[PDB]
Design a protein around this ligand. Structure first.
Ligand SMILES: Nc1ccn([C@@H]2O[C@H](COP(=O)(O)CP(=O)(O)OP(=O)(O)O)[C@@H](O)[C@H]2O)c(=O)n1
Ligand SMILES: [Mg+2]
Ligand SMILES: [Mg+2]
Ligand SMILES: [Zn+2]
Lengths: 97, 49, 1123, 49, 98, 146, 49
DNA sequence: CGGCAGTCGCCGTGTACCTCTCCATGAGCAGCATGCGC
DNA sequence: GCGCATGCTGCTCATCAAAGCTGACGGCGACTGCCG
RNA sequence: AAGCGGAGAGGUA
């Protein structure tokens, strides 16, 4: 990224389609963090399947703990195997009734 | 306002007790305005900039 | 005098004091004695009236009970508060981090009316914190002080205002209770008097008057003298009692069926029933004294009544009409006038006892609902007092007040004076008071009613100026909360010796003379014309014929810190305020010698502070050491006093005590036995005496800088000890338990040398920055998986190790949950004076050391003695503090000694000098009270008769000036210079606590900018105005580099570091993280923000698969580097 | 020899006008306080107390 | 401190506190002094509609200006004014001047 | 005054049906973290509890609707849900601000941007920098002007 | 809209900008400082770079 | 219909640095631990 | 001596709470009942 | 291979 390629900065209103386009998953539980294992709850406000892995090149259960297995998604947890910084650039959404 | 009674002695001779008391009204006001007008000055400067 | 072993310090004062200064800590202890209900307070109160000695907790308990349910078949009552013995002495609590308190018990009885049986038993109510002998509390191991609060007293206040358009007069009345709802009457634009019940809308007063039970003819029968009342009656169209009640009920309560019963009950349960309305004691007194209602009958049932409302309406109408005196049927005559809201007769004081009584009241109120509700859920014949009471709310309220509050404050322990002045402090802020920003300019001012009650000089100069003050020396506090001062009563022109304590309300009714008037040694004024203070605070010159009171002494209007400045009346108010504030910042030195010229206030300000040991009874000292003093009393009893050596203060200084008695001396009650931090033989000593020359010198004292000699470093004249404390905990974790040990992971055995056999360092070992104090190892995680987390020494610190304190869970010690061991290490160091340290004097002087010179190149006198400090002459005349040159002259005279030649008569200028002051020996100590001391004629006379040195030489002439030599060239200076002795003190602003630098360290989390502060390696903020300056200079690359790669660019930081280390060129910046966070937040607010390119196609701006290499090996700086 | 000919920027707050920031050539001194030229105390408005 | 409010009021382009009417056209001044309110009409010498400046409270003096005689005179009856000259004492109005 | 808005909604290609919401975005977790206290309890984060209230209310309303309850109860639930979302977006605009322990109003999304302590005026126009130091100043009457 | 939003009344400015669907050309001092490129003044104009 | 004047609500109120303390409860719901009875 | 029952005690979970509180003040605009 | 948020109080220029 280089600042010299910016030409304008537009603003506007967002519809529901845009909001569902930004999101990587829907949160459907108020739980945030576990008190025993100190890990994010499933499908909560800190879920790893939605926002991203907590530790570099690690899955949630036991499978992938190495760099060479990057890209593929665990078939049991579904959490992407990638860097840990992606947790500060992804969004979810809440589906109102 | 002005207090009709003046301070007829200098600091070289030494002020009396109530001459020294009625002379503290004028220093508190300066010390308090110094700490309250700077906000107005800074706000005006920010708007100008 | 009056102290058994005080040193002899002759005084210049001419007047006589009829009264001695009171105990300076009683403002704190009397309130607590009242609250507890101790016998001494009981006797004291019984002396001046034994009508009803009601304690502080017993009044709350009696205003709580009896407690009945809806039916009225059960009742519960509390009584007889009682305290047990304290759990542990203060030293143990301060050592173990526990609160110093005592158990509290009451007696509760439950009686059921149906059957008749009564069950009474004792009930436990928690631990009550207790006040020590100095007026401080010890909560969780920390010493705290509760400060008094200045509040506006409840009552009825009238106000006047001027119209903006019609230019008329609008009057208002406000009723302010202790707890309840307010009511305000007012006169609006036209002639219609209105009442705003509980600040909502504005209804004509006639509606309320009818609603309270007044016929449409009684108003004319009583209010039949004003036309505004006629106008209000004419446009009323209410004419009805029930109609008015319904109207008020509907207006006040929105959305409910306005039933007549509810309408007629709500009003009677809003201002008249003692459950939701109170005019506590003081409020009723002021209401009865304002309107002139019944006076003399004891006050009871403090609630607002209808007579008060009618009298208020009458008073307001008369005031608006323009009358001066009014009387109500059944009352005494009273004047009609608006009243000031800042007058010290309207502001009262909440002391510690009342502050904690309010919290106890809240706690008991919260418990009462639970107790009352538990009655209707369980079964009778099993209800006992121990089944309706839960003490959780009371303990919660107590613990939430004493900790985590704005009026219980961390104590100030720089030196004895700072601690003694922290109490004796009146604060306007607080819950129920004022605000620091939206304060104003008329409440931060000096009022003529503060004379004798609150010091006008001492106050902060920040944003708290005028909102914090200090009690005067002679003032005390009324039972209602009003401050009083003593006056000496004068009758028929003869000044008597009877003292009476008056408050501002009464002081506005007499004429009070001045303290320094010419008494003729027989009770009559020398000159009839005298300056007196009249009713409205104005001072006028009147013949001495109608006076009826006099001041007890000068210095009666100043506080304790302002009474230690000699020649105070020669300084301007600003510099005097600065000197009073700066006297409380001096750091204790290692010797602490006492001033050569001072005031008489130092001896009492040290005994009453509480940092010295004073004998309790007469006896013969049996043994003395550096640890204890054993005194053998005269009746065969023996007493041993222990001493605290090298004990750390709240602010990191050193607190020490040293015996000053021999092995056979005989002592007396109240005599001083041991010294303290800043004390010398019983007198407060905050600095040192130094030889001063006043002149400009080579530009090294330019703009308030100071030049110092090198003898003050060689001889430890200005040196101090500072102590520091470190902590570490061994807590449990999921993977295992942490333990302090020696088997650390791979680290050189050269650094494991000072550590003893089981962890902690050895006592006496010198430590530097980066050394290990205690060695702790924590399980790392998948054994042998361990990590190093030992306690290190922070940057820039050093010193010996004094003591080590180790607590353990194995030996059953009180520790929090999950911690097995706690270790504290104490490190001390000595500190010499150096460039950058701050010095000051008692007269507002202040500066930093710009240079320290060798002894052999400083100006020296004729006999060869160099000067110690050089002060510039360009700062004296324009700041209007010439008390320092007077102090210099008198200090030289005191140092050298004098002898007035009176062989043939006595000189005309020495007629008023007390004898025993006509001769002095070298190194004498003299006293100059605050507003009557040495005149300039006496100083000029003493300067001309001074003893010579060991040779027949006189170094300083009749003007106080000497001829000096030049230390570098040797040529004498061309003109004489002013030389003397001055008292200098060392402030606690040292350059060792202020230097800081950083190149790379810890960063934040949300935004990746460096952390701030010294505690963690922190960067300096580059604000908005600095950006303006950079943009005005035209520097477009410096600003970009400052804002991207040095602050926020996460990828540019490492590349810049690598380029710098390898010697190549600095690369180009990128995009900071703060902009990305801003875009994320804007999107989260449901806004569609996008960054477009030159032809549309919004940029992705979401990172990518870029170089992820970590070169340079070493961590950029977030943490240190291991071997 | 690593600090020679490498200027540094000195700043004092508040920065009311342009001359509140200025660039100097550093020289190593013994002690813990910064030394400032007498003539640049009016632009910064600084005095030594 | 007393001067700063005036500068802030000038830069912020507010209606001045002590506003003073400004004469529009050069005409025949007729000061019909009332009980406590002044009144000026300034009859247009060119010919038009009389400009009735009324409701002037007795809080201000009258401008001591250089009248037709070339000397400082207080605005009285039968005087002749110039286009755009303030009559009373106080601050003018920037919007009216524009 | 009405045209000032009607023309804005007409001229451009946007539509007015953006003032009514059907889904609510959630900010990434790294920007609303939780801090552990002395190895004990957590310190709360304000933003993590407004979302919690919103999701709890939505789940309760959905369960009530699926059960076929009377329309009045579902209307009450809908009113409470709307108030909850309003409190999330801007707290204190309408009614009593939502308070936590100690009856202290919580910080909403709109308070991250407005004021002298917001992101605009505190994190974008000024910053903290590296290679910076601070200390006390004294006088040297021997230096050159540079 | 970026400069105006960073001056005062952020909420009203942002609401008006969203309704109007405004676009920002990024040719000022405040905007360039915010996004992190060279200001168009002094040594940052084309004839000098 | 036509004005109209008050009233209410929201906006803003200088810069940089240092030291200290404290951070939700109550009540419910198991989970034992001890005493009593056969 | 064993089984049963009752009372300290650890663990766990909820947001709709309201009786308390009360010493800021100028500028500017919508708007709303209210008179005429 | 690892943490750093809020509230209040008191000070310096
Ligand atoms: N609240 C505050 C208090 C102080 N300051 C700053 O500290 C200095 C106080 O000078 P000062 O009044 O202490 C002496 P000076 O101004 O040099 O005049 P003199 O030499 O004739 O005695 C000012 O220059 C302010 O920039 C501030 O920014 N905000
Ligand atoms: Mg100065
Ligand atoms: Mg200064
Ligand atoms: Zn998995």
């Amino acid at each position: 990224l280089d600042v010299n390629f910016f030409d304008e900065l537009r603003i506007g209103l967002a519809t529901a389609e845009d909001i569902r386009q930004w999101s990587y998953g829907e949160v459907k539980k108020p739980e945030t963090i576990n008190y025993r294992t100190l890990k994010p709850e499933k499908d909560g406000l800190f879920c790893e399947k939605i926002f991203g892995p907590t530790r570099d090149w690690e899955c949630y259960c036991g499978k992938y703990k190495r760099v060479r297995f990057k890209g593929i998604i665990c078939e049991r947890c579904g959490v992407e195997v990638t860097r840990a910084k992606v947790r500060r650039e992804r969004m979810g959404h809440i589906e109102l009734a | 306002e002005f207090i009709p009674r003046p301070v007829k002695s200098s600091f070289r001779e030494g002020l009396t007790v109530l001459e020294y008391f009625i002379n503290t009204h004028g220093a508190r006001k300066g010390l308090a305005d110094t700490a309250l007008r700077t906000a107005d000055s800074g706000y005006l400067t920010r708007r100008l900039v | 005098n009056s102290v058994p072993g005080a040193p002899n310090r002759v005084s210049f004062a001419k007047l006589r004091e009829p009264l001695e200064v009171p105990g300076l800590l009683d403002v704190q202890t009397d309130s607590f004695e009242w609250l507890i209900g101790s016998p001494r307070w009981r006797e004291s109160a019984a002396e001046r009236g034994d009508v009803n000695p009601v304690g502080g907790l017993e009044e709350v308990l009696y205003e709580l009970s009896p407690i009945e349910d809806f039916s009225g078949s059960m009742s519960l009552s509390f009584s007889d508060p009682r305290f047990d013995d304290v759990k542990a002495p203060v030293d143990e609590c301060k050592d173990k981090d526990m609160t110093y308190a005592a158990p509290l018990f009451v007696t509760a009885e439950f009686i059921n009316n149906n059957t008749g049986e009564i069950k009474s038993q004792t009930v436990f109510m928690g631990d009550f914190p207790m006040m020590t002998e100095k007026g401080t509390f010890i909560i969780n191991g920390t010493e705290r002080v509760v400060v008094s609060q200045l509040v506006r007293s409840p009552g009825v206040y009238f106000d006047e205002t001027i119209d903006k358009s019609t230019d008329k007069t609008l009057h208002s009345v406000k009723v302010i209770p202790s707890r309840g709802a307010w009511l305000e009457f007012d006169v609006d634009k036209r002639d219609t008097v209105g009442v705003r019940i509980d600040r909502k809308r504005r209804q004509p007063v006639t509606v309320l008057l009818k609603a309270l039970g007044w016929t449409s003819e009684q108003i004319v029968e009583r209010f039949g003298f004003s036309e505004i009342m006629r106008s209000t009656l004419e446009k009323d169209n209410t004419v009805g009692t029930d109609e008015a009640l319904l109207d008020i009920y509907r207006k006040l309560r929105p959305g409910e069926p306005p039933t007549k019963e509810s309408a007629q009950t709500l009003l009677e349960n809003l201002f008249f029933k003692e459950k939701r309305y109170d005019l506590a004691r003081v409020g009723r007194y002021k209401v009865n004294k304002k309107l002139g209602l019944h006076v003399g009958e004891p006050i009871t049932s403090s609630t607002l009544t209808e007579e008060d409302v009618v009298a208020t309406i009458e008073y307001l109408v008369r005031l608006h009409e323009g009358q001066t005196t009014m009387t109500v049927p059944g009352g005494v005559e009273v004047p009609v006038e608006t009243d000031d809201i800042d007058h010290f007769g309207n502001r009262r004081l909440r002391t510690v006892g009342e502050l904690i009584q309010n919290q106890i009241r809240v706690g008991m109120s919260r418990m009462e609902r639970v107790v009352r509700e538990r009655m209707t859920t369980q079964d009778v014949e099993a209800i006992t007092p121990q089944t309706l009471i839960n003490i959780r709310p009371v303990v919660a309220a107590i613990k939430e007040f004493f900790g985590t509050s704005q009026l219980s404050q961390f104590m100030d322990q720089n030196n004895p004076l700072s601690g003694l002045t922290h109490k004796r402090r009146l604060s306007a802020l607080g819950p129920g008071g004022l605000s620091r920003e939206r304060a104003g300019l008329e409440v931060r001012d000096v009022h003529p009613s503060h004379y004798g009650r609150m010091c006008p000089i001492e106050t902060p100069e920040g944003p708290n100026i005028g909102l914090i003050g200090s009690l005067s020396v002679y003032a005390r506090v009324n039972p209602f909360g009003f401050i009083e001062t003593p006056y000496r009563k004068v009758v028929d022109g003869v000044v008597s010796d009877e003292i009476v304590y008056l408050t501002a309300d009464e002081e506005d009714r007499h004429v009070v003379a001045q303290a320094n008037s010419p008494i003729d040694a027989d009770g009559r004024f020398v000159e009839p014309r005298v300056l007196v203070r009249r009713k409205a605070g104005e001072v006028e010159y009147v013949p001495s014929s109608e006076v009826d009171y006099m001041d007890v002494s000068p210095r009666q209007m100043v506080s304790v810190a302002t009474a230690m400045i000699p020649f105070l009346e020669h300084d301007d108010a600003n510099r005097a305020l600065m000197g009073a504030n700066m006297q409380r910042q001096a750091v204790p030195l290692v010797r602490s010698e006492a001033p050569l010229v001072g005031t008489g206030m130092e001896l009492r300000a040290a005994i009453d502070a509480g940092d010295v040991v004073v004998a309790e009874e007469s006896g013969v000292i049996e043994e003395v050491s550096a640890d204890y003093i054993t005194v053998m009393h005269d009746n065969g009893t023996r007493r041993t006093y222990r001493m605290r050596k090298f004990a750390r203060s709240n602010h990191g200084t050193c607190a020490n005590q040293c015996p000053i008695v021999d092995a056979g001396d005989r002592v007396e009650a109240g005599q001083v036995i041991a010294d303290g931090p800043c004390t010398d033989d019983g007198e407060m000593a905050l600095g040192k005496n130094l030889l001063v020359a006043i002149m400009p010198w080579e530009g090294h004292n330019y703009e308030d800088a100071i030049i110092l000699s090198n003898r003050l470093v060689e001889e430890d004249v200005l040196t101090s000890i500072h102590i520091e404390e470190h902590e570490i905990d061994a807590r449990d974790t999921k993977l295992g338990a942490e333990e302090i040990t020696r088997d650390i992971p791979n680290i050189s055995d050269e650094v494991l040398a000072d550590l003893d056999e089981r962890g902690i360092v050895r006592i006496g070992a010198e430590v530097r920055d980066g050394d290990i104090l205690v060695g702790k190892v924590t399980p790392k995680g998948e054994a042998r998986e361990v990590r190093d987390t030992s306690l290190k020494v922070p940057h820039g610190e050093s010193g010996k190790v004094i003591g080590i304190r180790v607590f353990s869970r194995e030996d059953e010690d009180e520790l929090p949950a999950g911690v097995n061991e706690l270790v504290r290490v104490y490190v001390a160091q000595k500190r010499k004076i150096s460039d950058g340290d701050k010095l000051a004097g008692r007269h507002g002087n202040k500066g930093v050391i710009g240079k320290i010179l060798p002894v052999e190149d400083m100006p020296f006198l004729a006999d060869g003695t160099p000067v110690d400090i050089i002060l510039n002459t360009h700062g004296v005349p324009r700041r209007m503090n010439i008390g320092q040159i007077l102090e210099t002259h008198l200090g030289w005279c005191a140092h050298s000694g004098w002898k007035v030649d009176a062989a043939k008569g006595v000189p005309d200028w020495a007629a008023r000098l007390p004898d025993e002051l006509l001769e002095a020996q070298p190194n004498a100590i003299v006293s100059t009270p605050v507003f009557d001391g040495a005149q300039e004629a006496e100083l000029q006379g003493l300067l001309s008769c001074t003893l010579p040195n060991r040779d027949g030489d006189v170094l300083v002439d009749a003007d106080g000036k000497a001829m000096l030599f030049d230390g570098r060239s040797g040529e004498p200076f061309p003109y004489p210079v002013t030389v003397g002795y001055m008292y200098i003190m060392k402030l606690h602003h040292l350059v060792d606590d202020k230097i800081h630098a950083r190149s790379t360290g810890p960063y934040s989390m949300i935004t990746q900018q460096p952390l701030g502060g010294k505690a963690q390696f922190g960067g300096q903020r580059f604000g908005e105005m600095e950006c303006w300056a950079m943009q005005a200079y035209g520097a477009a690359y410096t600003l970009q580099e400052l804002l991207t790669i040095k602050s926020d660019d996460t990828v540019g930081r490492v590349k810049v570091y690598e380029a710098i280390v390898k010697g190549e060129n600095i690369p180009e910046p990128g995009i900071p993280e703060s902009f990305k966070v801003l875009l994320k937040e804007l999107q989260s607010l449901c806004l569609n923000v996008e960054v477009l390119s030159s032809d549309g196609a919004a940029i992705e701006l979401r990172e990518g698969e870029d170089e992820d290499l970590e070169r340079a090996a070493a961590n950029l700086g977030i943490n240190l580097s291991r071997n | 020899e690593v600090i020679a000919e490498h200027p540094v920027l000195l700043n004092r707050a508040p920065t009311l006008h342009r001359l509140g920031i200025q660039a100097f050539e550093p020289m190593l001194v013994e002690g813990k306080a910064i030394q400032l030229h007498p003539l640049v105390c009016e632009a910064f408005n600084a005095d030594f107390d | 401190t007393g001067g700063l409010p005036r500068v802030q009021e000038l830069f912020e382009a507010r209606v001045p506190r002590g506003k003073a009417p400004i004469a529009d056209v050069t005409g025949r001044v007729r000061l019909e002094d009332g009980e406590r309110f002044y009144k000026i009409t300034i009859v247009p010498d060119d010919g038009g509609e009389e400009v009735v400046y009324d409701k002037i409270s007795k809080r201000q003096r009258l401008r001591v200006f250089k009248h037709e005689d070339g000397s400082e005179r207080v605005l009285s009856d039968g005087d002749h004014v110039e286009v755009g000259q303030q009559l009373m004492e106080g601050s003018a109005d920037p919007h009216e001047v524009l | 005054k009405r045209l000032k808005v009607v023309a804005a909604f007409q001229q451009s290609g946007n539509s007015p049906m953006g003032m009514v919401l059907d889904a609510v975005p959630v900010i990434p977790p790294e920007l609303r973290p939780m801090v552990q206290l002395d190895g004990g309890r957590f310190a709360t984060s304000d933003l993590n509890d407004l979302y919690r209230r919103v999701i709890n209310r939505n789940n309760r309303l959905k369960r009530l609707i699926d059960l076929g309850a009377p329309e009045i109860i579902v209307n009450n639930e809908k009113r409470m849900l709307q108030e909850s979302v309003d409190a999330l977006f801007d707290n204190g605009r309408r009614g009593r601000p939502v308070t936590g322990p100690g009856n202290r109003p919580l910080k909403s999304l709109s308070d991250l941007l407005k004021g002298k302590q917001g992101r605009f005026r505190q994190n974008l126009l000024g910053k903290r920098v590296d290679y910076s130091g601070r200390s006390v100043i004294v006088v040297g009457p021997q230096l050159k002007l540079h | 809209w970026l400069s105006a939003a960073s001056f005062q009344e952020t909420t009203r400015v942002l609401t008006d900008a969203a309704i109007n669907c405004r676009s920002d050309k990024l040719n000022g001092l405040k905007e360039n400082v915010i996004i992190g490129k060279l200001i168009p003044a002094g040594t940052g104009i084309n004839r000098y770079r």
